[PDB]
Design a protein around this ligand. Structure first.
Ligand code: CLA
Ligand code: CLA
Ligand code: CLA
Ligand code: CLA
Ligand code: CLA
Ligand code: CLA
Ligand code: CLA
Ligand code: LHG
Ligand code: XAT
Ligand code: XAT
Ligand code: PQN
Ligand code: SF4
Lengths: 739, 168, 80, 41, 169, 160
């Protein structure tokens, strides 16, 4: 009878496994039409409509989190197992600059063995662009046995998380008060999870990754490198590489932290041997992060007369312009899972995009900057994940507004005041979007039409009307001057992208000053415009989710509904879901432009080879500066030019990329059937098909119905995203692996 | 209260007295969330398997079947027997027995009345009344636990030091 | 303004009237069904055409039918 | 094992098992007799 | 609880009661989700085919027919040397037999739909063995046991020919 | 011969294709070492390529001017193994599938809960029906004769 958990709440039985739709009150009666099948999967994780108790929803969410973490652990275990058994990691360790990472071999069936490429190191397989080899090298993993043991540990951890989810749904489910301890949860997630994870990783780096990687960079082969445990039992194997361990932990406890400058450095730049960040800098960074997060975890009052109450902090932040201020926000975020999901997903996607930027900007792994496929894939993948997560955060903000928003509890607070002037916000955001689009894109079109008319001096180019990004160049200058002036204890700039020397590893450029000209001005304003339009769609969905001048009772129709009818001139897509659908489209557009800008700019003005005398030759040859300012330039010098490797991949080991290119084109075009058409035509065609089936006595008892309007839109957008992202995926991968 | 094995720990609350080899040893409470019959069947299966395994390991390090394939130590016999297909036959017949076991354990858990580990295999008698059956069940459980620990030690020592039958 | 017609298949279940967002339909006495009531459309000038009325109709092919016609600031749902 | 067998009788599990078996025997026919453009007879 | 006579640690299977080979052997419960009459018909037909095929092995390796085609003591290699023409004629003749012996109703859903069909009872008894009902049950049990043994032996002989290649001897 | 094509056994471009593929595979084989699994895999690729080309040559296959086997599907039994025999095989298999599906639909359509037995298949009855589809050509031309294959006027029709 614990005060935090309920014991044996749900019986572990297979009876409900044999009753599909048991969770829903409407679906429990059984299918009558094929719409029931689709409704079954669309409501599976909508725990809000399955129970009327916040406690049950919270417990379901907790167990679902455990299942998700078990799935993630299984995926990581699979990655490590493939590295251990079906990879050339050992060969890549001895030749990182000449062996391509491969960790998946393809069975010899139907002639598909051509996919096993010549990745080097007496190996055949698919080249890997996830950068696991570089990460494992940065971890100090020098043998495939360690990868096997990490895979075994991942399997054990996945089983543990599965057992935890089962235990906390069926044997000991926490109570609502336990879930609502946001102060305790924040304290623990900030100190324990974040800070202690940073501290543990700093310890691992210092004791395992720092010596092993230093020996690897010195040229010591992985076979004669001591086993990682020997660096702990023997204080002399690590005190030779870093002659500060001879003093032990006495400098730490005597506040003489200057003695540890051997392995806790602040250098900046990149390791000249590997092209990645100095691992001493990384260990010092993780140590500082650990201390900062542990300190930050002692902020909120949990169980003693010590710390802050988030309710008292929020309620004190009022103002003349904001009425009641943040009063009621604590109740909103402690009684609505959707609001927490909105905030967490938005910040999580933004964090993913920031991670993507800082990855290539400052390569943190050895021999990852010179693996161009890995860098391109990591950036594009993380930016895509960030965009999807941001759209999801907007969607769940809209869901909270529709479902969990209480008008009485939010009288004259920030949420109320935002809804009260939603018109002004949306109208000014509309004006900003029109201004930004007009300018950015019409400058592009003006360049295109001036070039087409033979007026080269009328373009918005560097040798013409020039739009120099002076503000960004000022920041670039400030960073390259930071070491010794504003960061006096730095030896080198944080990233060579801001300026400095060309860093090359094995005649391949790792990082180099990224010059910003009029071409970068236009593409940056294109980014701003696309982001603003996506924000416009999502914010219009969130703010007008409850009511509008069209439908004053839109909240009574729910978050997900197709329309209110053909009246009022037509009320299609007025939902808030139909705004997360359009916003998904515009996020695809924005992220596609972002990754295109990254790919072309890097290939044209960063990546390449360096001659022995210091001459820099890039992959494309600097065509970004003069040919990325017109739409015809993007079509020809980027799309047409770099699509050559994809279309000429047939018969080679990259033929799978051409096949996926074609299939993604097919899927993207397939989406337009659902996006352009309507439900009535398909229902009436199914009518004649059903007539034929009845004529042959083969009409199913479950009456076949065309997909609902909302499901038609969902299928269309899912296929559109899959096709477009897969086309860009195949194009990028084939292009950057070939060259 | 105050289980027999660990006198300072409470009785596991699922093992009162009515099981052979029940000294109240369950400190981590495995019986609190798993069926007792299931755990008993698993323990008896492990006991029998490890008894056969210990006897086979010790004997095969002394006596070899005729043939060049059977001329390896028990430590290295796994990779040789799997290549020759010797372990494939054992796998096939063990899988047949284990499918019949799936049926048997399911029936035992859903009623029936079959005692855990009771396959009624008794060509000779060796157990005529309840008392003899209980005594022999206790002997089987104790010998099986001893053989499980013994096989564990044998394998660990042989892997550590590639020695013959004395694995010291 | 749109046109709304009521047909004698009306069972007088009132679901159309209580679904109209602009108070177009009302229940009037009748002798053609058990409930003794039939829907009426005396305020079609306020009809917006949202067709919520016939989404709540349980009869086989509807007893209230909305025919979209000429548009008006009331029928277009214009707050401006 | 009365409701578990009923769960295995559901449409998704049965379709997954049948399609896995179907792809399996197709792939194995194409392994043992590869590159079959015409009827073997 | 009764418990099976064959598998003594398992409950007695259902649906086998009035049969001529009941030893309570059905651990997987195949008689619960498959018609027992169809199962006995299939068991009897498989057994009879296996018996004929085992006798065919033993005679083929010994006697054989005159001709170049019929000159392989190994049954597995004889299946290939004989060519498709003699085998397809056997296939068509067996099909004709199947059609005429079951009188049209050949499938699991069609056979035993009307009942009145003892499993495995084709009425084939020209030599008259089986007029006495006392020995009829013993003959049925002997046929079942011989059929099962011949299924095991037919598999054994076929796989011996595959792993060795010469003959059975 | 038929349509101006020539047998692949006498098509020079066919042998040129075989030689070029083998040469590419051998050049790939040259960059690996000894009896290592990559060399074994490439050698297996070469052997399979040679076997496939030899089988296509000795298969009554007509090759065009590009040295690729062309299919003669006008209906002649001479090239009957290209389309006609696979056509018969597919017709048998697909008729089997359709027949067992229709039989299952009609069988569970006369029970108390027909819709339940469509998401939760009656595996015993499903297995019973599925193995009975080998007589689908005969069953179809025994149910059409009895009028049990086609509905007449209980089928629904739209307003016009
Ligand atoms: C969750 C991530 C994940 C993913 C995407 C894969 C994917 C793959 N694995 Mg794999 N694997 C994983 C986790 C994963 N594995 C884990 C956690 C382990 C440890 C147990 C393994 C152990 C493993 C082995 C030992 C092998 C594979 C193989 C394969 C490949 C063929 C799979 C196949 O045909 O199975 C078909 C499966 C079914 C039909 C079952 C239904 C495929 C690329 C095989 C391979 O690459 O062959 C060269 C192979 O031999 N995997
Ligand atoms: C220092 C203590 C601590 C630590 C380390 C964590 C760590 C975590 N919590 Mg958590 N939590 C804590 C205290 C702590 N919590 C307290 C005091 C409360 C009550 C207010 C909660 C309430 C809470 C909820 C409601 C949820 C989490 C979730 C999570 C996970 C976030 C997912 C993630 O980042 O993946 C990082 C993953 C890893 C690093 C993998 C290794 C982590 C393992 C599992 C250690 C977990 C520590 C655990 C608390 C120890 C208890 C053991 C048990 C025998 C008592 C993460 C594993 C979320 C989640 O995913 O649910 C499962 C979630 O929904 N926590
Ligand atoms: C932490 C992440 C997270 C979480 C927990 C949720 C959770 C939820 N969301 Mg949500 N969402 C997210 C991210 C997340 N979402 C993101 C990133 C987006 C932007 C795309 C959305 C957009 C969104 C909408 C628009 C809606 C939800 C809804 C819901 C609720 C019901 C979900 C459900 O039943 O789906 C069950 C799961 C499915 C139906 C799976 C569908 C399969 C997907 C679409 C295709 C995946 C393809 C995959 C990549 C493989 C393709 C490869 C190909 C080759 C085969 C639930 C509370 C719905 C709701 O009513 O909320 C109350 C709703 O209307 N969400
Ligand atoms: C190439 C196709 C295309 C184009 C041009 C646009 C253009 C636009 N969309 Mg978009 N959209 C598209 C495809 C496209 N969309 C698709 C496929 C979808 C489906 C998901 C959407 C969904 C969508 C939504 C949901 C929203 C938009 C919005 C917008 C507008 C953003 C404001 C802006 O930049 O206006 C400026 C106009 C342009 C940049 C177009 C070119 C104008 C030129 C360059 C300058 C002026 C030329 C001059 C006047 C010509 C005069 C001569 C002539 C008379 C002969 C803009 C009109 C948002 C909106 O309403 O606006 C705020 C919005 O909310 N779109
Ligand atoms: C866990 C049980 C087990 C397992 C997995 C093995 C496995 C192995 N034994 Mg072994 N063995 C066992 C028990 C076992 N033995 C016992 C109990 C004895 C004592 C009689 C022996 C005596 C023995 C000898 C003398 C030799 C092996 C050898 C070998 C290796 C290859 C040949 C072979 O399978 O053995 C053949 C096994 C036998 C000839 C005797 C087995 C007698 C069985 C185990 C007792 C009856 C149990 C019963 C049949 C259970 C029915 C199972 C049910 C599912 C139907 C192989 C690694 C050979 C080798 O390569 O040595 C390195 C070898 O020369 N074993
Ligand atoms: C479900 C359909 C199916 C069928 C009919 C077969 C049929 C066969 N498999 Mg098989 N197999 C299948 C699926 C299937 N496999 C799957 C999904 C896997 C895992 C990817 C395998 C892995 C596998 C291996 C590893 C082997 C077979 C082998 C065999 C053959 C002897 C047994 C036989 C032709 C064996 C064989 O003939 O190889 C010599 C063999 O060694 N199979
Ligand atoms: C829909 C049109 C279509 C048709 C007619 C074919 C036909 C063929 N394809 Mg093909 N294919 C298609 C679509 C099609 N494919 C698509 C969409 C793809 C992309 C995924 C492929 C990818 C593909 C590959 C990668 C390969 C083929 C191969 C083949 C050939 C061998 C077939 C086989 O395995 O037979 C043998 C198997 C059977 C006959 C199965 C039936 C056996 C049953 C069990 C009989 C039992 C009853 C007695 C055959 C000519 C293979 C080949 O050799 O090409 C010449 C080959 O390697 N195809
Ligand atoms: C940026 C302007 C800014 O944030 O100043 C801050 C300004 C000050 O508001 P308050 O003093 O009332 O805020 C006090 C508390 O609400 C703390 O949030 O907020 C506004 O007036 C919102 C108007 C946005 C107008 C957009 C232009
Ligand atoms: C004998 C047998 C079963 C016999 C049972 C008999 C007779 C009794 C039956 C009856 O009493 C019952 C039950 C009930 C009665 O009402 C009926 C009768 C009839 C009276 C099964 C054999 C079963 C035999 C089996 C399973 C053999 C498997 C062999 C394998 C797998 C060999 C593999 C290899 O040869 C390869 C493939 C390649 C090599 O290089 C490597 C290896 C590994 C050696
Ligand atoms: C495995 C097997 C039987 C296994 C039996 C087992 C395990 C029995 C175990 C038990 O009995 C015991 C031990 C004790 C009992 O108390 C309990 C049980 C449990 C009941 C039979 C295989 C039986 C296998 C058989 C019958 C295979 C026949 C193959 C034929 C005819 C092949 C013909 C071809 O191969 C050629 C000739 C040329 C090819 O190219 C073309 C074709 C046509 C494919
Ligand atoms: C075609 C179409 C239908 C009909 C589509 C239906 C009935 C979907 C049928 C799906 C089948 C029955 C199952 C899916 C079969 C696929 C082969 C499985 C997916 C492939 C896997 C690899 C995922 C609509 O209902 C509809 C509604 C609104 C707007 C546009 C449309 C629309 O375009
Ligand atoms: S159906 Fe399509 S068009 Fe007609 S109302 Fe609903 S959404 Fe608007």
């Amino acid at each position: 009878k614990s005060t935090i958990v309920d014991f044996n709440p749900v019986e572990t039985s297979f009876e409900k496994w044999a009753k599909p739709g048991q969770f829903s009150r409407t679906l429990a009666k059984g299918p009558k039409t094929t719409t029931w099948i689709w409704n079954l999967h669309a409501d599976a994780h909508d725990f809000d409509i399955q129970t009327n108790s916040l406690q049950e929803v919270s417990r379901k969410i907790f167990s679902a989190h455990f299942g998700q973490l078990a799935v993630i652990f299984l995926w990581l275990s699979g990655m490590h197992f493939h590295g251990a058994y079906f990879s050339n990691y050992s060969a890549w360790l001895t030749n990182p600059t000449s062996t391509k990472p491969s960790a998946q071999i393809v069975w010899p069936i139907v002639g598909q063995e051509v996919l096993n490429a010549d990745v080097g190191g007496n190996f055949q397989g698919i080249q890997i662009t996830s950068g696991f080899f570089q990460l494992w090298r940065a971890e100090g993993i020098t043998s495939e046995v360690e990868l096997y043991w990490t895979a075994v540990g991942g399997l054990v951890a996945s089983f543990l998380m599965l057992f935890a989810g089962w235990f906390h749904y069926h044997k000991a489910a926490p109570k609502l008060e336990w879930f609502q301890n946001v102060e305790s949860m924040l304290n623990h997630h900030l100190a324990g999870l974040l800070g202690l994870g940073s501290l543990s990783w700093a310890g691992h780096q210092i004791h395992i990754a720092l010596p092993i990687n230093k020996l690897l960079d010195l040229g010591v082969s992985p076979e004669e490198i001591p086993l990682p445990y020997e660096f702990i039992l023997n204080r002399d194997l690590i005190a030779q590489l870093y002659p500060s361990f001879n003093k032990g932990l006495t400098p730490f406890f005597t506040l003489n932290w200057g003695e540890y400058s051997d392995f806790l450095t602040f250098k900046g730049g990149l390791n000249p041997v590997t092209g990645g960040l100095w691992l001493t800098d990384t260990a010092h960074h993780h140590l500082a992060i650990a201390v900062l997060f542990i300190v930050a975890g002692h902020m909120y009052k949990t169980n003693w007369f010590l710390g802050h109450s988030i309710k008292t902090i929020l309620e004190a932040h009022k103002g003349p312009f904001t009425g009641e201020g943040h009063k009621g926000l604590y109740e909103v975020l402690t009684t609505s899972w959707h609001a927490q999901l909105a905030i967490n997903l938005a910040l999580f996607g933004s964090l993913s995009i920031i991670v993507a930027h800082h990855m290539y900007a400052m390569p943190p792994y050895p021999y990852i900057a010179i693996d161009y496929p890995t860098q391109l894939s990591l950036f594009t993948h993380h930016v895509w994940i960030g965009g999807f997560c941001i759209v999801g955060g907007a969607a769940h903000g809209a869901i909270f507004f529709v479902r969990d928003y209480n008008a009485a509890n939010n009288y004259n607070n920030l949420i109320d005041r935002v809804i009260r002037h939603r018109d002004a916000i949306i109208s000014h955001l509309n004006w900003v979007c029109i201004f930004l689009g007009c300018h950015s894109f019409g400058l592009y079109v003006h360049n295109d039409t001036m070039r087409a008319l033979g007026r080269s001096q009328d373009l918005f180019s560097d040798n013409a009307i020039a739009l120099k990004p002076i503000f960004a160049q000022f920041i670039q200058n400030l960073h390259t001057l930071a070491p010794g002036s504003t960061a006096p204890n730095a030896l080198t700039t944080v990233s060579y992208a801001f300026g400095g020397d060309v860093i090359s590893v094995g005649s391949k450029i790792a990082m180099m000053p990224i010059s910003l000209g009029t071409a970068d001005f236009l593409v940056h304003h294109i980014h701003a415009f696309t982001i603003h339009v996506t924000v416009l769609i999502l914010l219009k969905g969130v703010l007008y989710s409850r009511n509008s001048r069209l439908i004053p009772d839109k909240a009574n129709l729910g978050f997900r509904f197709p329309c209110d009818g053909p009246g009022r001139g037509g009320t299609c897509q007025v939902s808030a879901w139909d705004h997360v659908f359009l916003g998904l489209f515009w996020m695809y557009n924005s992220i596609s432009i972002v990754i295109f800008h990254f790919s072309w700019k890097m290939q044209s003005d960063v990546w390449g080879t360096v001659s022995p005398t210091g001459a820099v030759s890039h992959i494309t040859g600097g065509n970004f500066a003069q040919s990325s300012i017109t739409i015809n330039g993007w079509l020809r010098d980027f799309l047409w030019s770099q699509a050559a490797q994809v279309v000429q991949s047939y018969g080679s080991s990259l033929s799978a990329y051409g096949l996926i290119f074609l299939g993604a084109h097919f899927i993207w075009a397939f989406s337009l059937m659902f996006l352009f058409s309507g439900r009535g035509y398909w229902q009436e065609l199914i009518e004649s098909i059903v007539w034929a089936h009845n004529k042959l006595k083969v009409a199913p008892s479950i009456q076949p119905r065309a997909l609902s309007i909302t499901q038609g839109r969902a299928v269309g957008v899912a296929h559109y995203l899959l096709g477009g992202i897969g086309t860009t995926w195949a194009f990028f991968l084939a292009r950057i692996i070939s060259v | 209260e105050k289980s027999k094995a660990v006198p300072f720990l409470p009785r596991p609350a699922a093992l009162d007295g009515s099981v052979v080899g029940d000294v109240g040893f369950d400190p981590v409470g495995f019986t609190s969330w798993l069926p007792l019959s299931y755990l008993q069947e698993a323990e008896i299966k492990h006991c029998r398997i490890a008894m056969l395994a210990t006897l086979g390991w010790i004997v095969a390090d002394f006596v070899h079947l005729p043939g060049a394939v059977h001329e390896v130590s028990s430590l290295a016999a796994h990779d040789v027997a799997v290549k020759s297909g010797a372990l494939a036959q054992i796998l096939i017949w063990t899988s047949i027995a284990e499918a019949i076991s799936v049926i048997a354990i399911s029936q035992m858990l859903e009623g029936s009345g079959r005692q855990p580990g009771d396959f009624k295999f008794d060509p000779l008698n060796f157990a005529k009344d309840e008392k003899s059956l209980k005594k022999m069940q206790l002997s089987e459980l104790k010998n099986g636990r001893l053989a499980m620990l013994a096989f564990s030690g044998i394998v660990t020592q042989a892997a550590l030091t590639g020695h013959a039958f004395p694995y010291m | 303004s749109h046109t709304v017609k009521i047909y004698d298949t009306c069972i007088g279940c009132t679901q159309c009237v209580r679904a109209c967002p602009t108070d177009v339909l009302e229940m009037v006495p009748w002798d053609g069904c058990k409930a003794g009531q039939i829907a009426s459309a005396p305020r079609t000038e306020d009809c917006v055409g949202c067709k919520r009325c016939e989404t709540a109709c349980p009869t086989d092919f509807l007893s209230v039918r909305v025919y979209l016609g000429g548009e008006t600031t009331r029928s277009l749902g214009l707050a401006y | 094992m009365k409701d578990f067998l009923k769960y295995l009788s559901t449409a998704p599990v049965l379709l997954t098992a049948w399609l896995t078996f179907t792809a399996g025997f197709v792939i194995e026919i194409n392994r043992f007799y590869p590159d079959a453009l015409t009827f073997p007879f | 609880k009764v418990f099976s006579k064959s598998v003594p640690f398992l409950l007695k299977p259902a649906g086998l009661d009035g049969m001529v080979g009941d030893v309570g052997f059905d651990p997987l419960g195949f008689a619960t989700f498959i018609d027992i009459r169809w199962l006995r018909e299939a068991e009897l037909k498989n057994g009879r085919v296996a018996m004929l095929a085992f006798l065919g092995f033993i005679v083929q390796e010994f006697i054989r027919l005159p001709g170049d085609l019929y000159s392989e003591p190994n049954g597995v290699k004889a299946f290939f040397q004989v060519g498709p023409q003699p085998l397809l004629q056997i296939f068509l003749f067996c099909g004709f037999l199947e059609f005429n012996m079951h009188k049209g109703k050949l499938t699991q859903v069609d056979m035993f739909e009307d009942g009145k069909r003892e499993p495995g009872n084709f009425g084939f008894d020209p030599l008259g063995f089986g007029k006495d009902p006392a020995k009829r049950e013993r003959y049925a049990l002997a046929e079942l046991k011989n059929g099962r043994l011949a299924m095991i032996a037919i598999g054994g002989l076929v796989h011996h020919a595959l792993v060795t290649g010469h003959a059975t001897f | 011969d038929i349509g101006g094509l020539n047998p692949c056994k006498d098509s020079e471009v066919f042998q040129k294709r075989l030689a070029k593929t083998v040469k590419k595979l051998e050049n790939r084989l040259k960059k690996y070492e000894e009896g290592t699994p990559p060399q074994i895999a490439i050698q297996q690729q070469i052997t399979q390529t040679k076997q496939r080309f030899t089988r296509y040559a000795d298969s009554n296959l007509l090759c065009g001017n590009d040295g690729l086997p062309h299919l003669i599907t006008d209906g002649r039994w001479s090239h009957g193994s290209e389309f006609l025999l696979p056509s018969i095989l597919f017709l048998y298999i697909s008729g089997w599938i359709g027949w067992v599906g229709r039989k299952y639909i009609r069988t569970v359509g006369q029970t108390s809960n027909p819709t339940e037995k469509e998401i939760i298949i009656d595996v015993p009855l499903a297995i019973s029906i599925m193995t009975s589809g080998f007589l689908w050509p005969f069953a179809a031309w025994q149910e059409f004769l009895s009028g049990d294959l086609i509905a007449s006027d209980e089928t629904i029709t739209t307003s016009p």
